[PDB]
mmCIF file of C-alpha atoms in Angstrom:
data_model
loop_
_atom_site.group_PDB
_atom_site.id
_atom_site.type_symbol
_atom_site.label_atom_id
_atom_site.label_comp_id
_atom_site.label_asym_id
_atom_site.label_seq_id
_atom_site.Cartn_x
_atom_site.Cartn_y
_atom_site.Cartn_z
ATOM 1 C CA UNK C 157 68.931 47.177 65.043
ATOM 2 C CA UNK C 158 66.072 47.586 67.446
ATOM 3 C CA UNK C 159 67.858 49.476 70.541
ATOM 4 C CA UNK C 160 67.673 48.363 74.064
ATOM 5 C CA UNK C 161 65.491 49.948 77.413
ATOM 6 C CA UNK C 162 64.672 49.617 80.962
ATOM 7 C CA UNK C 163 61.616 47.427 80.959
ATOM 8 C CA UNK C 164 62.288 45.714 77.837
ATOM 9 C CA UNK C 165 63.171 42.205 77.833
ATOM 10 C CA UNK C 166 66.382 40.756 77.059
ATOM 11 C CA UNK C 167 66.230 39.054 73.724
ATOM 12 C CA UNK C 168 66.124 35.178 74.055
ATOM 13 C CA UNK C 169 68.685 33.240 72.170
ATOM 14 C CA UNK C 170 71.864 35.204 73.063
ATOM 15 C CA UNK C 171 74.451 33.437 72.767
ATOM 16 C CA UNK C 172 78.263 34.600 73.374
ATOM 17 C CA UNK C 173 81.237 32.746 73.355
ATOM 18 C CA UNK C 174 84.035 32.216 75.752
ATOM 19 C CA UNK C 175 86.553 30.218 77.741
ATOM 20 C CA UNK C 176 84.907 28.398 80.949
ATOM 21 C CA UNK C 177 87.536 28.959 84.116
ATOM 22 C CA UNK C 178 90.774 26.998 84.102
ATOM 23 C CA UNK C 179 93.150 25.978 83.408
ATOM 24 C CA UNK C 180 96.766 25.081 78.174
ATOM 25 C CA UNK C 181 94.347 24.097 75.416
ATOM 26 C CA UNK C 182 91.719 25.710 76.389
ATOM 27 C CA UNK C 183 88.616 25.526 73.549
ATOM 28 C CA UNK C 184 85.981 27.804 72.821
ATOM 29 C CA UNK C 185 82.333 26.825 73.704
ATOM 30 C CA UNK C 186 79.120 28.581 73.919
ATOM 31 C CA UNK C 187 78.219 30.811 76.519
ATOM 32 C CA UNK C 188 73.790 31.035 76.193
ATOM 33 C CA UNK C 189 73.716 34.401 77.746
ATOM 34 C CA UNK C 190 69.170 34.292 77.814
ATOM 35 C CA UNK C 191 69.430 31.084 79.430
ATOM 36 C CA UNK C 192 72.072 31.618 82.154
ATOM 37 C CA UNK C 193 70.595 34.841 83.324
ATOM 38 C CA UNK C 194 66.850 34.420 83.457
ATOM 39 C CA UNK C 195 67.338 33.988 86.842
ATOM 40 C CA UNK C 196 70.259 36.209 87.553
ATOM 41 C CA UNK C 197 70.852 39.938 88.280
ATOM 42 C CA UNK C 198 73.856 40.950 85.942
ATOM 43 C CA UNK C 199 75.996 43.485 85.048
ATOM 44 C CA UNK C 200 77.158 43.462 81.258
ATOM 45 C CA UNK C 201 79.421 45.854 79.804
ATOM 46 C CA UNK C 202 80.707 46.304 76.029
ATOM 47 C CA UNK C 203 83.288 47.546 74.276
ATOM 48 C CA UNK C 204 85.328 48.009 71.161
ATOM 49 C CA UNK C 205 87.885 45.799 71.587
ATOM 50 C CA UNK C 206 90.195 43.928 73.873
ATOM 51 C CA UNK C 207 93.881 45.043 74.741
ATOM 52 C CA UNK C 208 93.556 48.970 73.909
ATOM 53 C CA UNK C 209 95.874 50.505 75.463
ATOM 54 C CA UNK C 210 96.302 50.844 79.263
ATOM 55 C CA UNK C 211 96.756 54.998 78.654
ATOM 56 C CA UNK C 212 93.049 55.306 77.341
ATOM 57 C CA UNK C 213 89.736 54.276 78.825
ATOM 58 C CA UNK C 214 90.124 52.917 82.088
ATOM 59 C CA UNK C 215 86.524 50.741 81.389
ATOM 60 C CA UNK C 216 87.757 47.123 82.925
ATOM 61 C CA UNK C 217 89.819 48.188 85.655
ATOM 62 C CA UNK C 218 87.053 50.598 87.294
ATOM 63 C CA UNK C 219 84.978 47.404 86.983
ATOM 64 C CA UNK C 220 87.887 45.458 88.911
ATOM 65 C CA UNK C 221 87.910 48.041 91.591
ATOM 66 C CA UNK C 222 84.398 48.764 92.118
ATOM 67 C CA UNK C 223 83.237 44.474 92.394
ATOM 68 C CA UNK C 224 83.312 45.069 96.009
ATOM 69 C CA UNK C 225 80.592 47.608 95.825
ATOM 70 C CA UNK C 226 78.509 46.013 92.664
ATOM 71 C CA UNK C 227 78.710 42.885 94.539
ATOM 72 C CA UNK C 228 76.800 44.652 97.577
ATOM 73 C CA UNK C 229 74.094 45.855 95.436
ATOM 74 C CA UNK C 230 73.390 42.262 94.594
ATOM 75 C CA UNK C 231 74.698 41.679 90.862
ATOM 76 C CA UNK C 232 75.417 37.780 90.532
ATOM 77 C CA UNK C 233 77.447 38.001 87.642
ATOM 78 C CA UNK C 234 79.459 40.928 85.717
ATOM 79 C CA UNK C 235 80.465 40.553 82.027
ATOM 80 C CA UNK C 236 82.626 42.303 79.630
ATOM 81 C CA UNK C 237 81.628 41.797 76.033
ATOM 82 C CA UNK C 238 83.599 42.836 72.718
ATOM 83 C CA UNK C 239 84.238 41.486 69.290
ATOM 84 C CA UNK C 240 87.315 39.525 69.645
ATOM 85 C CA UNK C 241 87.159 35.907 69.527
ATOM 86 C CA UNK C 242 87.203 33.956 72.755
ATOM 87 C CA UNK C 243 91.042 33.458 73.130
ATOM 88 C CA UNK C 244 91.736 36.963 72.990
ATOM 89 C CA UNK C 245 88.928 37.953 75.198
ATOM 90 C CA UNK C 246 90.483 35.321 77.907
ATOM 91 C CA UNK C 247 94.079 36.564 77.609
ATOM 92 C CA UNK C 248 92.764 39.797 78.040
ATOM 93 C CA UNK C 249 91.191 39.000 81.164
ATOM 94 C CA UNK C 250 94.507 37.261 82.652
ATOM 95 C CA UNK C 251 96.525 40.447 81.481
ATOM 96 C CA UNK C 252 93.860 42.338 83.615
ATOM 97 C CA UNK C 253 94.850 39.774 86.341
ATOM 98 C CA UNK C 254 90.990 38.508 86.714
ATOM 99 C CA UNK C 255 90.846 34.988 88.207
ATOM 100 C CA UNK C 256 87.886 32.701 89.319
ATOM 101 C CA UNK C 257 85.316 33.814 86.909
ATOM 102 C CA UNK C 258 84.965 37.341 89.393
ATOM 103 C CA UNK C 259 84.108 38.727 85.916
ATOM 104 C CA UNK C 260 83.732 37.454 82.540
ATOM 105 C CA UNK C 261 85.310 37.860 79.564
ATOM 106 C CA UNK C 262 82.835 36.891 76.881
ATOM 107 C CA UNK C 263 83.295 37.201 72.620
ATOM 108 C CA UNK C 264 80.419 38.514 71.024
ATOM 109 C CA UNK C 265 80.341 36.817 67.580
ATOM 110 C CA UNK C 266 81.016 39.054 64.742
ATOM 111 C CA UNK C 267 79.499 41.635 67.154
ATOM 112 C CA UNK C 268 75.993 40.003 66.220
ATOM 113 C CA UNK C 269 74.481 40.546 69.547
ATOM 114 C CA UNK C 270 75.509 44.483 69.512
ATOM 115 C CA UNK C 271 74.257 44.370 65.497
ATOM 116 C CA UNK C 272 70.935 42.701 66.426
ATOM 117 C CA UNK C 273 70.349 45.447 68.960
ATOM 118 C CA UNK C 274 72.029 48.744 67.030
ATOM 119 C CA UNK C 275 75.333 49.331 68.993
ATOM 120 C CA UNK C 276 77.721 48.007 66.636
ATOM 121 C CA UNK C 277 80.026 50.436 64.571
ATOM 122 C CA UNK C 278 80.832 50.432 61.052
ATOM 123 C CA UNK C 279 83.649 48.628 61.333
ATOM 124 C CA UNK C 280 82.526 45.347 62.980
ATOM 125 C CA UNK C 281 83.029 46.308 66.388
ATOM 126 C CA UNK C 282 80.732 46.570 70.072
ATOM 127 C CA UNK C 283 80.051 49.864 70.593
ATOM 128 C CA UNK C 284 80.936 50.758 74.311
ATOM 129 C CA UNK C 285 77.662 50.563 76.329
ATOM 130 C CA UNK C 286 75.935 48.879 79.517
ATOM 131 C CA UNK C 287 73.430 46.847 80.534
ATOM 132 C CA UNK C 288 72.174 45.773 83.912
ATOM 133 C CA UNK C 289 69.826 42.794 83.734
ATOM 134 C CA UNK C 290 67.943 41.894 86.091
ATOM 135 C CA UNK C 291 66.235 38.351 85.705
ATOM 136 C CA UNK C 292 65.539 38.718 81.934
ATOM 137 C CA UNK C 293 64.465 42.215 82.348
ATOM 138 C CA UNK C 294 66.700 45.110 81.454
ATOM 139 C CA UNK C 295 66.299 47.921 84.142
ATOM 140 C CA UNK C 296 69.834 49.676 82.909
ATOM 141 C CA UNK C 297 70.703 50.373 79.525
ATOM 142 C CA UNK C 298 73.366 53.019 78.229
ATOM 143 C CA UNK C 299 74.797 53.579 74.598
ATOM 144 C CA UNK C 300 78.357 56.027 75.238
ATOM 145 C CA UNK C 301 78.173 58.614 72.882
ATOM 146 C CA UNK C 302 81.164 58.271 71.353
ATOM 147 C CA UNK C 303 83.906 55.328 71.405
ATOM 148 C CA UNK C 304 86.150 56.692 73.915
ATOM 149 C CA UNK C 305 83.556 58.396 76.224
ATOM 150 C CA UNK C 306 83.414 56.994 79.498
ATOM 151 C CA UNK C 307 80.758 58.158 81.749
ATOM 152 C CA UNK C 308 77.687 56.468 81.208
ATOM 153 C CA UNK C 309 78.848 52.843 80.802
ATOM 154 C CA UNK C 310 81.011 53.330 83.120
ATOM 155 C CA UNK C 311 81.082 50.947 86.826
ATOM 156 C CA UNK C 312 80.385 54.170 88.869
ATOM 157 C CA UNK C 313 77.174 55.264 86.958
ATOM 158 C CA UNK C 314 75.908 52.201 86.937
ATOM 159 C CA UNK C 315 75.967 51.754 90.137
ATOM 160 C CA UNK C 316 73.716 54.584 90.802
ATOM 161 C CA UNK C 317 71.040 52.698 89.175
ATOM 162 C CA UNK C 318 71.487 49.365 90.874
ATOM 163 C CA UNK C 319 69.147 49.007 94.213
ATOM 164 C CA UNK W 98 97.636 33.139 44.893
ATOM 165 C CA UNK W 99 101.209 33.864 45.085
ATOM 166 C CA UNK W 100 104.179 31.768 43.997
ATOM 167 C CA UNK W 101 107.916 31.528 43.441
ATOM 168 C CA UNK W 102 109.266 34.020 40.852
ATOM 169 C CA UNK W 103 106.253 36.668 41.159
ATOM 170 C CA UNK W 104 106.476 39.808 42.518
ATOM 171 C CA UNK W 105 105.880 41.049 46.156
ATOM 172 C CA UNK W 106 102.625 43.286 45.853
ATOM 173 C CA UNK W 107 102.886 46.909 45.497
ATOM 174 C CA UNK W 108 101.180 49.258 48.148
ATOM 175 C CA UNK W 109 101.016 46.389 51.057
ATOM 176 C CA UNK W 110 100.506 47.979 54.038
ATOM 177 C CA UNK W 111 100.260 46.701 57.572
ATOM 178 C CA UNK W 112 99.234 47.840 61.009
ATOM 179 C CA UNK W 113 101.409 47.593 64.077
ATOM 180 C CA UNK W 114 102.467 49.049 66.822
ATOM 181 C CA UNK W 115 106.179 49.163 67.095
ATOM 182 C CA UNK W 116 108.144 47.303 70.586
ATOM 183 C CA UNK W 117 109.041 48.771 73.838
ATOM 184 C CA UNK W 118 108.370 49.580 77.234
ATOM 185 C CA UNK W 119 107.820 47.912 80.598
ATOM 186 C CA UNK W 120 104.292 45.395 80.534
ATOM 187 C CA UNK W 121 102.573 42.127 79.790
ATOM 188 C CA UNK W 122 101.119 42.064 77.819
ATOM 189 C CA UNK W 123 99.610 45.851 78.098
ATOM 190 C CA UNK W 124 101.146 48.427 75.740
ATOM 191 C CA UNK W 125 101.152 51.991 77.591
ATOM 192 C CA UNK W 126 100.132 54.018 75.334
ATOM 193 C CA UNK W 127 101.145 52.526 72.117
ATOM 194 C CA UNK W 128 99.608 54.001 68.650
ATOM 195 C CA UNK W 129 98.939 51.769 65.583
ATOM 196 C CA UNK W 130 101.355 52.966 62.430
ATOM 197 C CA UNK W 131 101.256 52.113 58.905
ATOM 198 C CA UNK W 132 103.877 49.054 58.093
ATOM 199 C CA UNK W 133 104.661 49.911 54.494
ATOM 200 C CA UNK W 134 105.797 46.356 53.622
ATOM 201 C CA UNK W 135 106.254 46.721 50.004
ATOM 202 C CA UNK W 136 108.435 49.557 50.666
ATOM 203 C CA UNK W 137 110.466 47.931 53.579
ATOM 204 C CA UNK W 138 111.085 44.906 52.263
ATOM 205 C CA UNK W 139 112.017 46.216 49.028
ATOM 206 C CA UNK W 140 115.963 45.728 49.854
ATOM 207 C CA UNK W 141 115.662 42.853 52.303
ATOM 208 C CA UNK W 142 114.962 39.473 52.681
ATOM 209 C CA UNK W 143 111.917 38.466 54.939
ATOM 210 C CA UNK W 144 109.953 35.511 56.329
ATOM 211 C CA UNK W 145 106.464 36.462 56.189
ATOM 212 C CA UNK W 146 104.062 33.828 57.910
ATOM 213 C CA UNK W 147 100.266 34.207 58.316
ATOM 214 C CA UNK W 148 98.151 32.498 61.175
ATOM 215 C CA UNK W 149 94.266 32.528 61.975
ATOM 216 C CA UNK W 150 94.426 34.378 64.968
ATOM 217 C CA UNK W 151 96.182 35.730 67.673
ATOM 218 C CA UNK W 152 96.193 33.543 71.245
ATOM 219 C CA UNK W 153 95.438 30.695 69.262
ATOM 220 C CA UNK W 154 96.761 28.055 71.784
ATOM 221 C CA UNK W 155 100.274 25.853 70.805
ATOM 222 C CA UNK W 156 98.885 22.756 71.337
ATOM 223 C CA UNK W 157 96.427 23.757 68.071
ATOM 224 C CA UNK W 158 99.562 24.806 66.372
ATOM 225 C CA UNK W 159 103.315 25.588 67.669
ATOM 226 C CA UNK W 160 103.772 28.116 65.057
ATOM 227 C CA UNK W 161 105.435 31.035 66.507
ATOM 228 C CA UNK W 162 107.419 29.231 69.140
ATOM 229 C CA UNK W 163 109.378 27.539 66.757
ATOM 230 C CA UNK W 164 110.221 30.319 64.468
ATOM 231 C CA UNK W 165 111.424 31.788 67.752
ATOM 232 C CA UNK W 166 113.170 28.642 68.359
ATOM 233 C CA UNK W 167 115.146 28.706 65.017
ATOM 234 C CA UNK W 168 115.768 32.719 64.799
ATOM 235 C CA UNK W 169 119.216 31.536 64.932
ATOM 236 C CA UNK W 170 119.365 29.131 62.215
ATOM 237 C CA UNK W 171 116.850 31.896 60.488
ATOM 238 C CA UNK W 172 118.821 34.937 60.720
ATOM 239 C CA UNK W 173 122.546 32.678 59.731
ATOM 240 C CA UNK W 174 120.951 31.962 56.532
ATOM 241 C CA UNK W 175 120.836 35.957 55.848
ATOM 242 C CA UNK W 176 117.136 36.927 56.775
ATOM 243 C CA UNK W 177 116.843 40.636 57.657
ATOM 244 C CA UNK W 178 112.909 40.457 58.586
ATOM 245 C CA UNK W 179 111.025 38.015 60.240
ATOM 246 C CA UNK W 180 106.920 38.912 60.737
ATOM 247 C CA UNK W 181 103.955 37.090 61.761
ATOM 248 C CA UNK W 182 100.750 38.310 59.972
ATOM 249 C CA UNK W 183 97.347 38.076 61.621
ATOM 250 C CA UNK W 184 93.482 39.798 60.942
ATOM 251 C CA UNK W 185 93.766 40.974 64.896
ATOM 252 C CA UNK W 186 94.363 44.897 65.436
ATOM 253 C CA UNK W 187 97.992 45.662 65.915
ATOM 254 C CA UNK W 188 96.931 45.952 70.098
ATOM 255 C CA UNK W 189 96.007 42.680 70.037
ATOM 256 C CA UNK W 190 99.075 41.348 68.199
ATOM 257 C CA UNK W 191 101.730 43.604 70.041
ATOM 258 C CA UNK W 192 100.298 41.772 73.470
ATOM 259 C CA UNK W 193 100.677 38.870 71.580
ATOM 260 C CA UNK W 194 104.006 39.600 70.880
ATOM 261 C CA UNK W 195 105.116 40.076 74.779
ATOM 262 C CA UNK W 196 103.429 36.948 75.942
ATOM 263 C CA UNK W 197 105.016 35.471 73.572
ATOM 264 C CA UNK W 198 107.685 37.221 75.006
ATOM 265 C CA UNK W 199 109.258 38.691 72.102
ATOM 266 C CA UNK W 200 111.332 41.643 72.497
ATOM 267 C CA UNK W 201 112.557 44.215 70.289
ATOM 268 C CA UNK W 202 111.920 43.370 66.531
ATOM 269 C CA UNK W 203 113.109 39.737 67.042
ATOM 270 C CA UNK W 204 109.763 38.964 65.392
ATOM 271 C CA UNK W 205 107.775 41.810 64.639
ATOM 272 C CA UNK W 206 103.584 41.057 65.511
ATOM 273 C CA UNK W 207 101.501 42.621 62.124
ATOM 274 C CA UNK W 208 98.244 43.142 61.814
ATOM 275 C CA UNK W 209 96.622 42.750 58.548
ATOM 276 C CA UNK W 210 93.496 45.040 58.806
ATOM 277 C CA UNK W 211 90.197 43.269 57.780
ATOM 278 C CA UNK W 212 92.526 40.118 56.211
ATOM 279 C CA UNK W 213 93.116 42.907 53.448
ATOM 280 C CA UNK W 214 96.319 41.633 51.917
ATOM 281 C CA UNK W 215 95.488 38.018 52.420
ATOM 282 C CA UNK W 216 92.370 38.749 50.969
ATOM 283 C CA UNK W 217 94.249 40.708 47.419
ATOM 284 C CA UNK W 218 95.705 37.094 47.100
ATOM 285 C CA UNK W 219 93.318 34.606 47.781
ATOM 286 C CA UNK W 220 94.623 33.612 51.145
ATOM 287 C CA UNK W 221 91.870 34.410 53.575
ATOM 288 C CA UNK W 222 88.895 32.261 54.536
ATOM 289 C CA UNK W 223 85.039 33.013 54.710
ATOM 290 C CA UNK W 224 85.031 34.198 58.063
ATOM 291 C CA UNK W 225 87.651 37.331 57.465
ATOM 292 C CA UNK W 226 90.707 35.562 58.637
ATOM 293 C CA UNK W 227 93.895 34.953 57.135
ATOM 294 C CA UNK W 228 95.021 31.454 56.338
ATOM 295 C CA UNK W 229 97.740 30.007 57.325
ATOM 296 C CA UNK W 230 100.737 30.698 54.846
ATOM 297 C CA UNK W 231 104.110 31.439 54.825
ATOM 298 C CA UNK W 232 106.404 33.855 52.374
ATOM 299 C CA UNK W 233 110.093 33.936 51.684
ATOM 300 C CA UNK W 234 110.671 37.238 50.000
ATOM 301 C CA UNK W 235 114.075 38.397 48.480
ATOM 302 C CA UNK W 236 114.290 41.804 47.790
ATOM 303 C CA UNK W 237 111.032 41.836 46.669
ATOM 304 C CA UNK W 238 110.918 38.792 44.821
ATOM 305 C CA UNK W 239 109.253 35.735 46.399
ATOM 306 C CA UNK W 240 111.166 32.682 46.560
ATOM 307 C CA UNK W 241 108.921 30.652 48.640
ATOM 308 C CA UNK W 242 105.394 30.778 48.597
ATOM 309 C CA UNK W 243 103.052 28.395 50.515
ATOM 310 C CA UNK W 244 99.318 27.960 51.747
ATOM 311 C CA UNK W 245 98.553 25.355 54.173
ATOM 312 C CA UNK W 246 95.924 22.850 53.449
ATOM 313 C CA UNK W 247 93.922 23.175 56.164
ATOM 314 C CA UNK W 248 93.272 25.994 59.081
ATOM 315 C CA UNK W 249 95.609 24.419 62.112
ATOM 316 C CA UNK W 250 97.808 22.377 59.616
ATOM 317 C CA UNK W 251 101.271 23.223 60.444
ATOM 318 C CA UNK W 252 103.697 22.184 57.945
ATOM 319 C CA UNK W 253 103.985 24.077 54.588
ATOM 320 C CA UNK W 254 104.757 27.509 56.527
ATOM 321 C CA UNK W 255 106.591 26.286 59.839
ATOM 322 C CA UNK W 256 109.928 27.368 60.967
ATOM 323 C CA UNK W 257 111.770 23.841 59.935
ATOM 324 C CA UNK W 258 110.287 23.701 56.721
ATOM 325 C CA UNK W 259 110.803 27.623 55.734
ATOM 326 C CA UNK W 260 114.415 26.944 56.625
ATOM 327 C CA UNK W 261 114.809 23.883 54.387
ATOM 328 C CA UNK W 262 114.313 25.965 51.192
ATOM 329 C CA UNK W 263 116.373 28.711 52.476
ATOM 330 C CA UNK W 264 119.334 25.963 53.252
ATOM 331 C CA UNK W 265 118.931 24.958 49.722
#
């Protein structure tokens, strides 16, 4: 794909999918990620795939503990992205206890976001990467190198480059 | 696809990660294993039903609640194995499993990696699911063999309808 930067823009027509809050037959629907944020500062985070275990990668739950802090720094909205389909993604988020929308739980489609952009894997999956977006502008943007490596991705470096 | 009289597959392998432990619906530290099926099943006799997905709500399709519902019935009528098969990683279905609050191997929660299997016998769909099937299998021999007509049409490969042609 074509790799992401700070100063690029984010790519228009991104569209995710997901489960809107509460409460159940909860359906699928869109989630236009170019039109939502245009006007937003946001935090987005990937990775390969809901429900790993809770002995690896602590990605989500650093997120969880450090809203407090991102919130300060003036990020409207923080997103985690991966592969799985929208009612995975939300029972993921309830099994990491997340309630009122404090961060979202969004389905990239067959990964085509992450494909479009060159941080998908061979196998179909997100790679595990971050983006801070800042009103349609990118001013953040990490690739881990590896699947498990957390460090650059991770809440606590990102923070460092959030004014 | 597959039908009554033919032969279980050779070399069918699964993913999953076997039941334990303390939380819902996080496994600690679980690993993914090889489910040899072909070689399990080889002595046993095993309900096998396939879904679309994972988390798929009940009110779409009460699948696994009422195999759950009729274990009972299911396991009076001699069944060793009962498995749900899905595309999802064997993380995702083993957290399926506990909210679905499932303990032990009650119901064990497979994975079939990339719809592989499903795939071998014509049973997936364009989007690298499986469809929605069920499988009766005697010692390696399939007695029961059924694809649903549609993606959340329950009937062919629920619980009541598996254990009408095992009561026969």
């Amino acid at each position: 794909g074509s790799g992401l930067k700070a100063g690029d823009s984010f790519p228009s027509d991104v569209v995710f999918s997901y489960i809107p809050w509460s409460e159940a037959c909860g359906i699928p629907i869109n989630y236009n990620a170019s039109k939502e944020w245009a006007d937003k500062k946001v935090i987005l985070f990937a990775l390969p795939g809901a429900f790993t275990p809770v002995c690896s990668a602590r990605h989500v739950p650093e997120y969880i503990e450090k809203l407090p802090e991102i919130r300060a720094k003036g990020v409207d909205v923080v997103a985690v992205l991966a592969y799985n389909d929208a009612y995975v993604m939300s029972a993921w988020g309830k099994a990491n206890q997340v309630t009122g929308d404090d961060i979202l739980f969004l389905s990239d489609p067959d990964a085509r976001f992450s494909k479009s952009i060159g941080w998908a894997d061979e196998e179909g999956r997100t790679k595990r990467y971050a983006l801070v977006i800042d009103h349609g502008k990118i001013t953040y943007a990490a690739l881990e190198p590896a699947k498990n490596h957390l460090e650059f991705s991770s809440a606590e470096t990102v923070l460092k480059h959030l004014h």
